[PDB]
Symmetry: C3
Subunit: 230 residues, 3 copies
Amino acid sequence: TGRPEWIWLALGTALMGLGTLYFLVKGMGVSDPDAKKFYAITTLVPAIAFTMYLSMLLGYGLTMVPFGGEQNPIYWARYADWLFTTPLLLLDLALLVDADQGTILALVGADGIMIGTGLVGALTKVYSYRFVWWAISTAAMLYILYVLFFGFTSKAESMRPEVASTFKVLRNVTVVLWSAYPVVWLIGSEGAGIVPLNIETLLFMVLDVSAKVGFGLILLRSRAIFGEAE
Amino acid sequence: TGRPEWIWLALGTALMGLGTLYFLVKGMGVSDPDAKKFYAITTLVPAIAFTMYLSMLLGYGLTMVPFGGEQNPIYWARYADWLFTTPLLLLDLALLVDADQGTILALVGADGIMIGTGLVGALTKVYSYRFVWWAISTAAMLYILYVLFFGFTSKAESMRPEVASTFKVLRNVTVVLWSAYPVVWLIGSEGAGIVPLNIETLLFMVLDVSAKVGFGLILLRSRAIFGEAE
Amino acid sequence: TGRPEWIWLALGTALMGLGTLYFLVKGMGVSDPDAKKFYAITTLVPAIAFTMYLSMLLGYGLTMVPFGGEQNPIYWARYADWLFTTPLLLLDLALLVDADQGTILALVGADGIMIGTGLVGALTKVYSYRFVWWAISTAAMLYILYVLFFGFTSKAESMRPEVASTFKVLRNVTVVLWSAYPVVWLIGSEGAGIVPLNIETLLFMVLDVSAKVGFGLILLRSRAIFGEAE
Ligand SMILES: CCCCCCCC/C=C/CCCCCCCC(=O)OC[C@H](O)CO
Ligand SMILES: CCCCCCCC/C=C/CCCCCCCC(=O)OC[C@H](O)CO
Ligand SMILES: CCCCCCCC/C=C/CCCCCCCC(=O)OC[C@H](O)CO
Ligand SMILES: CCCCCCCC/C=C\CCCCCCCC(=O)OC[C@H](O)CO
Ligand SMILES: CCCCCCCC/C=C\CCCCCCCC(=O)OC[C@H](O)CO
Ligand SMILES: CCCCCCCC/C=C\CCCCCCCC(=O)OC[C@H](O)CO
Ligand SMILES: CCCCCCCC/C=C\CCCCCCCC(=O)OC[C@H](O)CO
Ligand SMILES: CCCCCCCC/C=C\CCCCCCCC(=O)OC[C@H](O)CO
Ligand SMILES: CCCCCCCC/C=C\CCCCCCCC(=O)OC[C@H](O)CO
Ligand SMILES: CCCCCCCC/C=C\CCCCCCCC(=O)OC[C@H](O)CO
Ligand SMILES: CCCCCCCC/C=C\CCCCCCCC(=O)OC[C@H](O)CO
Ligand SMILES: CCCCCCCC/C=C\CCCCCCCC(=O)OC[C@H](O)CO
Ligand SMILES: *C/C=C(C)/C=C/C=C(C)/C=C/C1=C(C)CCCC1(C)C
Ligand SMILES: *C/C=C(C)/C=C/C=C(C)/C=C/C1=C(C)CCCC1(C)C
Ligand SMILES: *C/C=C(C)/C=C/C=C(C)/C=C/C1=C(C)CCCC1(C)C
């Protein structure tokens, strides 16, 4: 393809596809109802990402947005992916710690605001206003990270030790990886335009595969996803 | 801004923002799991409205629709707000009366039809057909109001007296305020065009703040949102 | 109207409308909470389809997509219908057999991928790539049909005999009817273009009414939707 970033979109498609197939085969035969929930959530995540990476590779998930006096290539398909995959990742963490329903609704709702405002920012034609939406989205992200540390960590330590241990690892992975996304957006083609689109696409591919397939490998190898039984 | 209705969009943004912050601080420290559910639902409502009012203020949430031989300004962001906030408001009422799952699904589904058909009507280019969609949406609204009076009132009176009392007030607020929306649409810029857009925008701002922040102030001050405990 | 397929859109609108009204009246007075769930899910299905058939009849739900060097009429409103009605139909089947939550999430998620990739395929401007999306969507469909036969049939036979019996019939109806959709798409205006749009529209109308109103008549006449009580 004639876009230099094609190679990273192709690799991302392949890695999300391979991760989906691996999780699908690994979950074959699992009969524990708690483990089935985690396999279902965790396999859906790279499956959705696979479809949206493929849409970017083939050019469907790209649009041109005028701002700063240029026509700027915006990959809108990222937001369609993240709208569904980021609440699913949060549901994996919430189910692990048996979070109450009100906390789950708060997290999923804040996450929806985060991604939706990011999408508005990405498509906004007045340059200075793009950063207003970025700030609102980032505030929603900070709310999510606060709950994961000062609601979820406190509950986990009261549960089975393998649940506490696996939650603590996946919480730390999540906070580090998710915090990089607003930074890549700010310095890349959607924001200040300091990093070119080809490098930005590489960075999001590394983050996405780590936050989805890496995350899932840790979770689905854990004893924490099974009920305690004899 | 050069649009006369800007002042009402600005005030609406500010009031939804202030209401979100108030509910967020008030819900700090609440540990009762039932109360947490109500705080989460009720704080999300003005937070979503805040983002969509801001999108209208900055001009993102506006499009031009040709009908009647003119280019007509249609604020489409209202429907994106209401798609999520109106089912959340109904969930507050349904949880208060411990409604059965089938009734909740009926209400949320009718509400989705109401808002979705309103959006189609708002974007329809053949003038006479706009009113066909308005009629279908209004029928869905009447179904909702019927359930709130002839399903929900009957259940409430069988529950704790503080639940019955708070439900009856919030039901009455809801029926009065929600019934005004189809009337404003019909006589305003989306419909017959008798009331100008600046006044229409004022009317929806008053209704929205009352139906979201007013509603939430009544609910979150009530004893009904807490479990009965010693 | 000047489109030859109008007659089938009109008939489909009428039949979905009549089926909605019939199910609404039949469900009046039902007080069993399990039966209420099934009436709510099953009445919503033709109600949503009614609105989307009407949008196609009036011309709102149609767009033109260039591919193969022509402007091709694509009825996009079908996908908006199916996005909501196909998971509702699967929920009817899953509730009947008391499926576990993980299996329900797998089914609904695969169904979302099926319809979303179908929509991307329908709107794709590069002709050969339309069939890549068709293949991905069809793979998701095959996953769904596998679960209905090799997860759901095995559970049903362990339940009440009237539940097993009604599930087996509705499963067979579902597999036969749903399998025809990818074939109609492939040979019709969205795909290879061998069957003209007027005949394609007839075929989808027959399938839709059978898969929604036919399905619902079988289910809502069954004893299986009521709890076992004295
Ligand atoms: C997990 C095991 C594998 C670990 C792998 C980690 C990779 C993640 C980071 C990649 C950034 C690469 C940056 C590449 C920078 C090239 C940009 C460039 O060409 O910049 C020069 C320009 O011409 C003038 O400034
Ligand atoms: C809660 C405590 C505060 C209560 C506040 C309630 C306000 C709600 C209603 C406002 C309608 C105002 C209508 C303003 C009409 C002005 C339109 C106008 O200018 O019309 C004249 C025109 O030039 C030729 O007909
Ligand atoms: C339930 C009881 C009622 C059962 C009813 C079942 C109907 C379903 C199938 C219809 C296909 C009809 C196909 C009509 C074909 C006409 C196309 C045509 O005109 O093709 C000739 C063309 O001019 C040169 O090839
Ligand atoms: C001027 C101020 C403007 C408005 C501020 C920016 C709005 C968007 C940002 C963040 C979303 C905040 C989180 C929304 C969800 C809160 C849920 C909540 O309150 O949950 C309580 C529950 O007890 C928990 O377990
Ligand atoms: C419990 C459930 C909670 C759910 C919480 C969800 C909150 C989402 C809020 C705001 C983002 C809205 C974003 C809307 C973006 C639409 C952009 C679009 O499609 O624009 C069309 C065109 O490109 C230009 O007119
Ligand atoms: C806890 C997780 C938080 C995650 C969110 C952290 C956000 C703030 C980070 C960086 C902003 C630094 C300033 C970037 C703006 C630079 C503007 C500019 O003009 O830069 C010129 C350029 O450096 C040469 O050409
Ligand atoms: C010609 C007729 C055309 C069709 C009519 C217009 C369709 C749209 C209008 C209203 C939605 C109706 C409500 C949809 C949901 C009904 C749910 C239901 O039946 O719920 C039963 C349950 O027992 C409860 O607890
Ligand atoms: C339990 C879950 C129940 C959920 C019930 C939901 C029912 C929604 C039904 C119909 C409205 C569909 C509205 C679709 C509007 C799309 C308009 C649009 O985006 O148009 C694009 C462009 O502007 C022009 O081609
Ligand atoms: C229970 C809640 C129900 C809520 C829904 C109630 C709907 C009917 C209300 C009003 C319609 C009145 C007729 C409006 C149409 C007027 C058309 C016209 O030409 O008006 C000329 C104008 O009055 C001078 O220029
Ligand atoms: C190169 C390969 C590319 C990727 C493949 C194509 C992706 C889209 C197709 C099918 C969706 C598959 C189903 C997605 C949901 C799986 C859910 C699951 O694993 O559920 C386990 C649970 O135990 C159950 O009860
Ligand atoms: C538990 C919840 C699981 C939910 C699982 C859902 C999976 C959906 C995945 C992919 C399809 C995405 C389709 C996006 C299509 C948007 C097309 C569009 O609107 O295009 C705009 C314009 O026409 C051109 O730029
Ligand atoms: C279990 C359910 C599975 C459902 C899915 C089954 C998919 C495969 C079916 C048919 C493809 C047959 C080939 C169609 C392609 C024909 C291409 C062509 O050029 O046809 C010329 C035409 O026949 C004269 O003009
Ligand atoms: C699978 C993909 C993941 C986990 C993606 C996560 C994305 C975010 C945390 C995005 C956050 C953003 C902001 C906080 C500000 C605006 C830009 C966004 C959407 C990139
Ligand atoms: C927070 C906002 C609220 C509670 C908005 C409520 C909106 C409605 C009840 C809208 C109803 C409409 C009709 C019944 C007919 C068509 C026009 C609509 C969407 C305005
Ligand atoms: C009420 C409508 C129903 C039950 C519609 C069902 C539709 C499908 C099973 C569609 C499947 C498709 C594929 C498997 C491939 C691509 C084309 C689709 C969307 C037609």
